[PDB]
Amino acid sequence: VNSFSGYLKLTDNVYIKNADIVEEAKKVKPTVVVNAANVYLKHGGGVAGALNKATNNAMQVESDDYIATNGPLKVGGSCVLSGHNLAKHCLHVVGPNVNKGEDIQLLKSAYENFNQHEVLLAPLLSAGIFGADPIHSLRVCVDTVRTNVYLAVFDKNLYDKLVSSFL
Ligand SMILES: Nc1nc(N)c2ncn(Cc3csc(Cl)n3)c2n1
């Protein structure tokens, strides 16, 4: 038993809700929140900008020290950093950004990072301003992640479409 409430059950291990990831993390305080990061951990918009803003820029400060020491992530890769006031940990995961010309086949690789964590609160990777098809991202998530993932979709209209089209 965990603290997640109000989710539609999609499969044995995947759940979904129409929620802003920031409000959802502040309420649950999960062990792991996933950030939809870029390789530079530059948290400008989408999920990253919203999460970072909620940490009063502490996420960005921590991230800049990480990059200065380790260099950029790979597309498809991840790193674990602090969750600040939102979670114990933040798993920064880089899905392919379609609007950047990155290979969408790396979306499966990106979701594989979730399997290193028993339970996660996460957004749909590569959706929204990353330019991939959200229906596709949800399908790759369900077909790749084996651990317990609580998916949050902020756009109501998108949420309704994802549910009604899910096989
Ligand atoms: N659950 C949630 N909460 C937000 N505050 C939010 N903002 C943009 N998206 C969609 C998204 C997924 S991956 C990238 Cl990039 N954007 C969000 N999803």
XYZ file of C-alpha atoms and ligand atoms in Angstrom:
185
model
C 0.000 0.000 0.000
C 1.284 3.484 -1.031
C -0.104 7.063 -1.000
C -1.242 7.514 -4.648
C -4.969 8.355 -5.007
C -7.401 8.802 -7.864
C -5.578 6.782 -10.604
C -7.028 4.768 -13.479
C -5.377 1.339 -13.543
C -4.114 0.592 -17.114
C -2.154 -2.650 -16.539
C -0.720 -4.716 -13.703
C 1.927 -2.013 -13.067
C 0.901 1.203 -14.922
C -1.567 3.789 -13.538
C -2.617 7.191 -14.949
C -4.240 10.405 -13.684
C -5.092 13.877 -15.045
C -2.797 15.949 -12.818
C -0.102 18.608 -12.839
C 3.096 16.761 -11.855
C 4.073 19.577 -9.447
C 0.812 19.485 -7.490
C 0.883 15.678 -7.506
C 4.469 15.480 -6.145
C 3.764 18.047 -3.393
C 0.767 16.019 -2.197
C 2.318 12.519 -2.332
C 6.019 13.254 -1.709
C 6.979 10.023 -3.589
C 10.258 8.252 -3.224
C 10.967 9.068 -6.910
C 9.618 11.773 -9.205
C 10.737 11.602 -12.843
C 11.834 14.781 -14.583
C 11.517 15.029 -18.367
C 15.072 16.343 -18.681
C 17.439 17.311 -21.465
C 21.072 16.200 -21.658
C 22.287 19.513 -20.168
C 19.828 19.414 -17.252
C 18.748 22.923 -18.305
C 15.271 23.035 -16.685
C 13.608 25.660 -18.899
C 10.066 24.490 -19.612
C 7.626 21.617 -19.701
C 7.947 19.348 -16.688
C 11.555 20.403 -15.939
C 10.821 24.123 -15.711
C 7.741 23.509 -13.565
C 9.535 21.094 -11.218
C 12.578 23.359 -10.974
C 10.410 26.433 -10.253
C 8.717 24.530 -7.425
C 12.192 23.888 -5.856
C 12.969 27.642 -5.922
C 15.753 26.851 -8.488
C 17.555 24.448 -6.113
C 17.129 21.689 -8.701
C 18.955 23.831 -11.290
C 21.796 24.683 -8.875
C 22.303 21.007 -8.061
C 22.044 20.094 -11.756
C 24.669 22.624 -12.856
C 27.141 21.168 -10.330
C 26.324 17.656 -11.651
C 27.017 18.690 -15.274
C 30.192 20.585 -14.359
C 31.536 17.359 -12.812
C 30.151 14.683 -15.157
C 29.303 16.298 -18.484
C 25.999 15.873 -20.298
C 23.715 12.863 -20.149
C 22.980 10.709 -23.190
C 19.648 10.875 -24.970
C 17.920 7.814 -23.511
C 19.908 8.113 -20.277
C 19.260 9.306 -16.746
C 20.766 10.336 -13.445
C 19.440 10.312 -9.870
C 19.612 13.609 -7.980
C 17.774 15.083 -5.008
C 13.997 15.406 -5.048
C 14.273 18.613 -2.963
C 10.827 19.558 -1.553
C 8.963 17.367 -4.095
C 10.269 13.778 -3.516
C 13.085 11.893 -1.907
C 14.803 11.566 -5.312
C 14.414 13.007 -8.787
C 15.194 10.650 -11.656
C 16.149 12.965 -14.538
C 15.377 10.997 -17.716
C 16.200 12.186 -21.243
C 13.669 11.053 -23.838
C 14.264 11.940 -27.500
C 13.136 15.432 -28.444
C 11.435 15.146 -31.842
C 11.652 18.958 -32.426
C 15.479 18.542 -32.068
C 15.632 15.668 -34.610
C 16.559 13.015 -31.994
C 15.719 9.338 -32.711
C 12.281 8.345 -31.218
C 13.519 4.720 -31.024
C 15.495 5.937 -27.952
C 12.147 6.428 -26.185
C 12.207 2.756 -25.148
C 15.748 3.183 -23.797
C 14.599 6.222 -21.827
C 11.733 4.295 -20.209
C 14.093 1.408 -19.289
C 15.623 3.727 -16.674
C 12.349 3.480 -14.732
C 12.983 -0.228 -14.094
C 15.768 0.648 -11.634
C 13.124 2.020 -9.201
C 10.294 0.041 -7.568
C 7.737 2.893 -7.640
C 7.769 6.229 -9.538
C 5.591 9.275 -10.170
C 6.290 10.269 -13.772
C 5.103 12.316 -16.747
C 4.742 10.932 -20.266
C 8.263 11.075 -21.746
C 8.839 12.853 -25.089
C 5.219 14.222 -25.133
C 4.196 17.910 -25.119
C 7.025 20.235 -26.284
C 9.331 17.242 -26.959
C 7.130 16.660 -30.029
C 6.433 12.909 -29.971
C 3.005 11.256 -30.186
C 1.687 10.875 -26.579
C -0.387 7.808 -27.532
C 2.880 6.259 -28.655
C 4.748 7.293 -25.505
C 2.060 5.698 -23.323
C 2.266 2.449 -25.332
C 6.072 2.327 -25.061
C 5.778 2.980 -21.310
C 3.336 0.097 -20.797
C 5.448 -2.237 -22.977
C 8.781 -1.307 -21.323
C 8.349 -0.405 -17.643
C 7.883 -3.380 -15.308
C 8.034 -1.481 -12.007
C 5.065 0.450 -10.595
C 4.616 3.717 -12.465
C 2.042 6.418 -11.659
C 1.670 8.533 -14.806
C 0.400 12.128 -14.630
C -0.985 13.915 -17.718
C -1.653 17.634 -17.126
C -3.670 18.437 -20.275
C -7.294 17.378 -19.689
C -8.087 16.996 -23.385
C -4.977 14.877 -23.910
C -5.832 12.754 -20.860
C -9.309 12.025 -22.228
C -7.841 11.031 -25.594
C -5.180 8.752 -24.063
C -7.785 6.847 -22.019
C -10.290 6.411 -24.836
C -7.649 5.191 -27.303
C -5.776 2.794 -24.990
C -5.785 -0.856 -26.069
N 1.933 15.818 -15.510
C 2.465 16.989 -16.146
N 2.557 18.096 -15.431
C 3.026 19.223 -15.943
N 3.152 20.389 -15.101
C 3.418 19.241 -17.304
N 3.909 20.190 -18.141
C 4.067 19.616 -19.336
N 3.703 18.315 -19.252
C 3.662 17.321 -20.311
C 5.040 16.826 -20.679
C 5.518 15.485 -20.650
S 7.068 15.366 -21.142
C 7.158 16.972 -21.417
Cl 8.532 17.766 -22.048
N 6.052 17.727 -21.153
C 3.285 18.065 -17.998
N 2.816 16.929 -17.408
